Amino acid sequence: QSVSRAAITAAYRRPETEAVSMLLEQARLPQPVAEQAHKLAYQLADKLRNQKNASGRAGMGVALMCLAEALLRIPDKATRDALIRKGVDMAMRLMGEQFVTGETIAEALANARKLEEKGFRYSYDMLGEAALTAADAQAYMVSYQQAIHAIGKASNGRGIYEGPGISIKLSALHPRYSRAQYDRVMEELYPRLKSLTLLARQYDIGINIDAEESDRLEISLDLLEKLCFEPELAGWNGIGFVIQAYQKRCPLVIDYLIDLATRSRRRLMIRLVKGAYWDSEIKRAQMDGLEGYPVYTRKVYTDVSYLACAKKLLAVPNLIYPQFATHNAHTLAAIYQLAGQNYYPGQYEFQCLHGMGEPLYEQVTGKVADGKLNRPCRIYAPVGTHETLLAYLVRRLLENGANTSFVNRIADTSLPLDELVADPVTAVEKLAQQEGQTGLPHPKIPLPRD
Ligand SMILES: Cc1cc2nc3c(=O)[nH]c(=O)nc-3n(C[C@H](O)[C@H](O)[C@H](O)COP(=O)(O)OP(=O)(O)OC[C@H]3O[C@@H](n4cnc5c(N)ncnc54)[C@H](O)[C@@H]3O)c2cc1C
Numbered sequence: 001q002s003v004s005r006a007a008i009t010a011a012y013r014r015p016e017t018e019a020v021s022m023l024l025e026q027a028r029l030p031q032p033v034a035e036q037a038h039k040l041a042y043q044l045a046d047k048l049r050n051q052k053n054a055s056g057r058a059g060m061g062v063a064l065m066c067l068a069e070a071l072l073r074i075p076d077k078a079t080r081d082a083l084i085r086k087g088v089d090m091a092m093r094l095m096g097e098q099f100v101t102g103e104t105i106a107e108a109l110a111n112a113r114k115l116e117e118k119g120f121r122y123s124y125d126m127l128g129e130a131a132l133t134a135a136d137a138q139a140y141m142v143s144y145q146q147a148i149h150a151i152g153k154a155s156n157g158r159g160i161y162e163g164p165g166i167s168i169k170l171s172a173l174h175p176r177y178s179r180a181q182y183d184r185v186m187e188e189l190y191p192r193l194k195s196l197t198l199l200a201r202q203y204d205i206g207i208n209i210d211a212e213e214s215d216r217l218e219i220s221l222d223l224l225e226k227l228c229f230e231p232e233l234a235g236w237n238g239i240g241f242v243i244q245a246y247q248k249r250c251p252l253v254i255d256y257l258i259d260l261a262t263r264s265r266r267r268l269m270i271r272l273v274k275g276a277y278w279d280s281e282i283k284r285a286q287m288d289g290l291e292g293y294p295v296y297t298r299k300v301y302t303d304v305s306y307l308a309c310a311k312k313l314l315a316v317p318n319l320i321y322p323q324f325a326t327h328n329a330h331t332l333a334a335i336y337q338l339a340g341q342n343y344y345p346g347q348y349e350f351q352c353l354h355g356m357g358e359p360l361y362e363q364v365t366g367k368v369a370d371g372k373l374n375r376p377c378r379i380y381a382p383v384g385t386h387e388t389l390l391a392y393l394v395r396r397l398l399e400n401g402a403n404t405s406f407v408n409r410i411a412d413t414s415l416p417l418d419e420l421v422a423d424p425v426t427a428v429e430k431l432a433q434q435e436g437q438t439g440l441p442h443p444k445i446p447l448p449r450d
Helices: 003-011 016-027 031-049 062-072 077-082 085-099 105-110 134-155 182-202 214-228 250-263 278-288 299-314 329-338 390-401 424-435
Strands: 120-126 165-168 207-209 239-244 268-273 320-325 349-353 377-383
Touching: 003 214, 003 250, 016 299, 016 424, 031 329, 085 390, 105 120, 105 134, 105 377, 120 134, 134 165, 134 182, 165 182, 182 207, 182 214, 207 214, 214 239, 214 250, 214 278, 239 250, 250 268, 250 299, 250 320, 268 299, 299 320, 299 329, 299 424, 320 329
Parallel strands: 120 165, 120 377, 165 207, 207 239, 239 268, 268 320, 320 349, 349 377
Antiparallel strands: none
């Protein structure tokens, strides 16, 4: 292929100067929107950093404090004044616990009330991916079926917006997905996706297809397409799909999705993310030696791409329910303002990962009279034992440990608030004036062919 499909294909690895140049004006916040976004972003980030007065205590050596402490333990003021494989597995469980909501779906669900009453929602992720065998993919299938029964019984008719949903990885459902061919995927994967989706629809819960490596985008779109034309799913808007703003293709995937929502007569639940596989995408493309990268090479370009994509999503509320997944205070504030006046719950939601977003979103989800924005946030809640945790945990270490990540920079008491929540379009224009051109690749990430 269609006009929209062909256009996705042609953007696959387009030069970054080109892709970034096209995004800029789509991403630019109008003057007054930009300033309200800056102000809200500043406030959110200020409260986050300075929760237990962490910077007000910078406002006030360690040898002296130990002495002052000992002096303060003197009860009477008078007296006072007068005077390899195993270490890896273990470190994975230790660092990983904070990102895991529960070992089994019943445990995760039994703990869902606490934040659900404050206005949070959930999307449960049964951990496990990249099934290597037929038996592995069968077992993921059965754990996903079980989970949908449990979530859907706990949802109890609350529906796709207010009620919990599930997130699935297509790589978990087909053996050796990473290299699977079109005909085997449609024969084997598709019937399992279809079957899980019909079930989610019986319980009226959201079912989201997580986005994985970039060479699987095309087949995921083929799968989505067919799924959307199933008669048993006519009139039901519970199908969710993730799109990754770090891809050059993202805006073109949106044009495709908008047309698919129209043709298939539905509102798609669309989770807009930046993306989780960036380090591997770079390594992969550097090993393939092709014309370029399928993702951006500077983090700021991903930020610009997200904003441009978010505007596109928000323009079509009849066709898309945007779910804006982020832990970045500027990103959140920009979307808040871009969504305009006259919020209604079904307009959009935020999303966050368990163990990462609660502090940001405790300022967002909840009543205005408690100093909150009163916007709903859906927590992505991984569910599984230590044997399903590795790959997800590694992605979290990369996310938390990267110096370009907001969650890393916020902890840096030296980087001032204003730089942290700096507007990405303005940042790109600043680079462009310094460097001579808009959208030049990261200086340390040359094209694969070099
Ligand atoms: C609820 C939820 C669901 C998610 N589901 C998925 C999913 O299905 N598939 C998936 O891939 N991701 C998914 N993610 C996104 C991913 O897991 C990260 O959480 C997200 O990319 C971080 O973005 P941020 O705005 O919070 O942080 P920010 O710090 O503002 O942005 C961080 C990121 O920018 C990108 N980046 C980093 N360095 C560079 C660089 N040099 N050049 C270009 N881009 C760079 C990466 O995407 C990285 O995550 C999900 C996130 C959430 C919150």
